[PDB]
């Protein structure tokens, strides 16, 4: 027919809804495992066998050794974090991990001087009108700008002739220091270990839009693709301007691998119980109180590498149908239900008020959402633990009757209930 | 179900490939015209009754008053060319446009130093390293680049406080300011008749997302989505950095509109019998000669605003199998092929040879498609005149023959056999 179908899973809030859960659980099997848009600052979480990892740049599956990681053009990529990255698994138990990892050509580069100038930008936003993004300053913001100005440079031209290389390396610097004069650049400092990461390279990469397509319609093959970040960090669609520069929503698996829509198949959306949010921007449930540090505290919301912790809130249904519009989630998985199992009642957002009035849809301009009521429903809780459920039976009344309630909500049949933090702490409705 | 799926129309080469003579014969009916992605730089030409236009940034379909016009979220505004353009056509017969048309609240705006910046970037990397982009200089690229750095302004925050938007207007300019300090700025100048446009614009403005859910998920419609630039023009997929800085691709219709991929129906990929490209960057069929000078003359391949000849050269298809791996075309359009009508034989490009060896993909990095050899088939021509062709038997044989090359080659269905200009000058095949 046409070929092989993706797998994708998509975060429907603002982050770390559990996505790396999910997708470690799904890859188990799969032939690829695939990145598509983003950075190194994903964060993505898992655990399996009492053996905690935090991949940032290589998919969450390049645990799997029979599968194969793979990242695709739409990614950018800081090289030192990357083997750093690498590293530091490699001293959890990761071995021949170089050997099933792919790297695409087209992909870009974020430089060193790129994370210094996120970092300016961030403190220069900081001390003028006293308010900035909330980036991880990891130049994820400014290889994007450099991406569309096509100043950037990509994978494909490091490996090509490094003389032409290191002149438009010259230059972009030259460019970016005129952002910032403040900004300094070891020039043949970075462009001296650049090179070496060149020849470490080199063995991985190939040509994202040739092997995706040999993949989709060569004999068939599971690829699952992992997004990153989150709807509502969205670029396009997100809090704009309180949001990262890349798509992560469906259509980044389009521009970020290079496959047709008709290549996409099953788009799961990872929802997490109550909702988090880090860095700054409007979050209409955010409970700073009692109830935010509990779920701050019951369900480790907080810096896995600074240890900041992120703003919680009660699950908010206004940002999760605007979610499914953009995505069209065929089906979701609900993380960190056991989170709530100690509250007696549980509220949660159905709708936005502004000026007793309620609004139609999600607004696009974030500092109106700093101004809208938000219309709760409060739900009784279960007032019981269920971190040991493996099925839909063991899940007490209250605990059903939630998932039911996103479920009937957001018109997407959830598929899974993340009750705890390990593989097996799943629940598989169908 | 999921609701009505979208067709989309795109470009398959490098760009003027007649697409808006595509999207005008598939919009006489259909119930929404929408743009996705790119800014007033499409060049979309339309006849129809003696009646030529050249659309840039209005959609192709802003003629029929049964249908709505609508700009999508991925695309770039630069209000002033908004106006300027609907006004020319505004004197060709055209009139309540005004009222068919919808914009997204979400679409970013290109301001007057972004087309001014756009200039000094191309002139400087001109003066210096004796080669630029070959930029339509109309702020597309620096717009982009503020939009990836969160920098940029939204249709939604013009229509909000005028005066957190003017702060926000001071600081980027300044910021372009520091790019290029020759670079002036006529501060409340400009801030001025934004605030004129504000007002113009109100009444057309509305939420894209939630516009274009309604759409697909309420009752059947039927919309039509105008791809701009092309395939190769891609910021992701085309001759980077020789390219445009939007995804001319598939994805960009999801990215660009807020639509999911299962939400996309027939994608048109619309392929001219010769190739031409109009900018810098590798063109390896390209035909400096004779025979350039004449496709390049019985096509009217020139600048339909600054009369910028394009360069013309044979069919590629290279450029058009790389190009359906990333698209997924369900069927072709083949435009101009009585341009070819004169010639005795035709020569069509199959494949690229670097160092007497067939390379096995387009490759990424553009310059090394500047040294490849192209390894051609040489077809015969039908030495006869086609414009009066209506259906497939009228074409003579030699003409049947090279429609049927491009389709095996490319293994994509041609459903169109453009042999004129006008509207009637279709031969829809099936
Ligand atoms: N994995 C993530 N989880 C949650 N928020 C994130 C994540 N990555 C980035 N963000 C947010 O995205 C915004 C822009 O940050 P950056 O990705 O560094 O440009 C900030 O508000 C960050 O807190
Ligand atoms: N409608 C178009 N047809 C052909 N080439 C185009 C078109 N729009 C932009 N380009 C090319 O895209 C590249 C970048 O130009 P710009 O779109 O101004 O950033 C240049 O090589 C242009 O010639």
Same mark, same amino acid.
């Given at each position: 027919?046409?070929?092989?179908?993706?797998?994708?899973?998509?975060?429907?809030?603002?982050?770390?809804?559990?996505?790396?859960?999910?997708?470690?659980?799904?890859?188990?099997?799969?032939?690829?495992?695939?990145?598509?848009?983003?950075?190194?600052?994903?964060?993505?979480?898992?655990?399996?066998?009492?053996?905690?990892?935090?991949?940032?740049?290589?998919?969450?599956?390049?645990?799997?050794?029979?599968? +194969?990681?793979?990242?695709?053009?739409?990614?950018?990529?800081?090289?030192?974090?990357?083997?750093?990255?690498?590293?530091?698994?490699?001293?959890?138990?990761?071995?021949?991990?170089?050997?099933?990892?792919?790297?695409?050509?087209?992909?870009?580069?974020?430089?060193?001087?790129?994370?210094?100038?996120?970092?300016?930008?961030?403190?220069?936003?900081?001390?003028?009108?006293?308010?900035?993004?909330?980036?991880?300053?990891?130049?994820?913001?400014?290889?994007?700008?450099?991406?569309?100005?096509?100043?950037?440079?990509?994978?494909?031209?490091?490996?090509?002739?490094?003389?032409?290389?290191?002149?438009?390396?010259?230059?972009?610097?030259?460019?970016?220091?005129?952002?910032?004069?403040?900004?300094?650049?070891? +020039?043949?400092?970075?462009?001296?270990?650049?090179?070496?990461?060149?020849?470490?390279?080199?063995?991985?990469?190939?040509?994202?839009?040739?092997?995706?397509?040999?993949?989709?319609?060569?004999?068939?093959?599971?690829?699952?693709?992992?997004?990153?970040?989150?709807?509502?960090?969205?670029?396009?669609?997100?809090?704009?301007?309180?949001?990262?520069?890349?798509?992560?929503?469906?259509?980044?698996?389009?521009?970020?691998?290079?496959?047709?829509?008709?290549?996409?198949?099953?788009?799961?959306?990872?929802?997490?119980?109550?909702?988090?949010? +880090?860095?700054?921007?409007?979050?209409?449930?955010?409970?700073?109180?009692?109830?935010?540090?509990?779920?701050?505290?019951?369900?480790?919301?907080?810096?896995?590498?600074?240890?900041?912790?992120?703003?919680?809130?009660?699950?908010?249904?206004?940002?999760?149908?605007?979610?499914?519009?953009?995505?069209?989630?065929?089906?979701?998985?609900?993380?960190?239900?056991?989170?709530?199992?100690?509250?007696?009642?549980?509220? +949660?957002?159905?709708?936005?008020?502004?000026?007793?009035?309620?609004?139609?849809?999600?607004?696009?301009?974030?500092?109106?959402?700093?101004?809208?009521?938000?219309?709760?429903?409060?739900?009784?809780?279960?007032?019981?633990?269920?971190?040991?459920?493996?099925?839909?039976?063991?899940?007490?009344?209250?605990?059903?009757?939630?998932?039911?309630?996103?479920?009937?909500?957001?018109?997407?049949?959830?598929?899974?209930?993340?009750?705890?933090?390990?593989?097996?702490?799943?629940?598989?409705?169908?």
């Amino acid at each position: 027919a046409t070929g092989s179908r993706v797998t994708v899973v998509l975060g429907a809030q603002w982050g770390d809804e559990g996505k790396g859960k999910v997708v470690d659980l799904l890859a188990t099997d799969a032939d690829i495992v695939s990145r598509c848009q983003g950075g190194n600052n994903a964060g993505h979480t898992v655990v399996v066998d009492g053996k905690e990892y935090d991949f940032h740049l290589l998919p969450s599956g390049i645990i799997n050794t029979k599968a +194969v990681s793979f990242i695709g053009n739409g990614v950018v990529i800081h090289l030192p974090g990357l083997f750093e990255e690498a590293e530091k698994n490699e001293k959890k138990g990761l071995k021949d991990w170089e050997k099933r990892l792919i790297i695409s050509d087209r992909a870009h580069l974020v430089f060193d001087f790129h994370q210094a100038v996120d970092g300016l930008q961030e403190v220069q936003r900081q001390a003028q009108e006293g308010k900035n993004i909330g980036t991880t300053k990891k130049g994820i913001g400014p290889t994007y700008s450099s991406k569309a100005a096509r100043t950037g440079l990509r994978i494909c031209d490091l490996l090509s002739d490094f003389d032409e290389f290191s002149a438009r390396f010259k230059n972009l610097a030259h460019q970016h220091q005129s952002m910032f004069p403040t900004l300094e650049i070891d +020039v043949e400092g970075q462009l001296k270990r650049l090179k070496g990461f060149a020849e470490r390279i080199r063995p991985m990469v190939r040509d994202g839009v040739y092997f995706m397509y040999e993949a989709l319609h060569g004999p068939p093959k599971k690829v699952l693709v992992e997004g990153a970040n989150a709807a509502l960090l969205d670029i396009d669609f997100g809090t704009y301007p309180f949001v990262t520069s890349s798509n992560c929503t469906v259509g980044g698996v389009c521009t970020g691998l290079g496959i047709p829509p008709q290549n996409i198949g099953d788009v799961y959306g990872v929802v997490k119980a109550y909702t988090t949010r +880090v860095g700054i921007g409007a979050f209409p449930t955010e409970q700073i109180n009692e109830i935010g540090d509990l779920l701050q505290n019951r369900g480790h919301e907080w810096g896995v590498t600074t240890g900041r912790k992120r703003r919680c809130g009660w699950l908010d249904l206004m940002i999760l149908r605007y979610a499914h519009m953009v995505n069209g989630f065929t089906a979701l998985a609900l993380t960190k239900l056991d989170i709530l199992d100690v509250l007696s009642e549980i509220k +949660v957002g159905i709708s936005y008020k502004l000026n007793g009035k309620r609004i139609p849809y999600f607004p696009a301009n974030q500092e109106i959402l700093q101004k809208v009521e938000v219309e709760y429903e409060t739900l009784p809780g279960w007032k019981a633990d269920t971190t040991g459920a493996r099925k839909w039976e063991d899940l007490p009344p209250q605990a059903q009757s939630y998932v039911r309630f996103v479920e009937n909500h957001m018109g997407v049949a959830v598929k899974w209930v993340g009750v705890g933090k390990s593989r097996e702490s799943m629940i598989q409705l169908f």
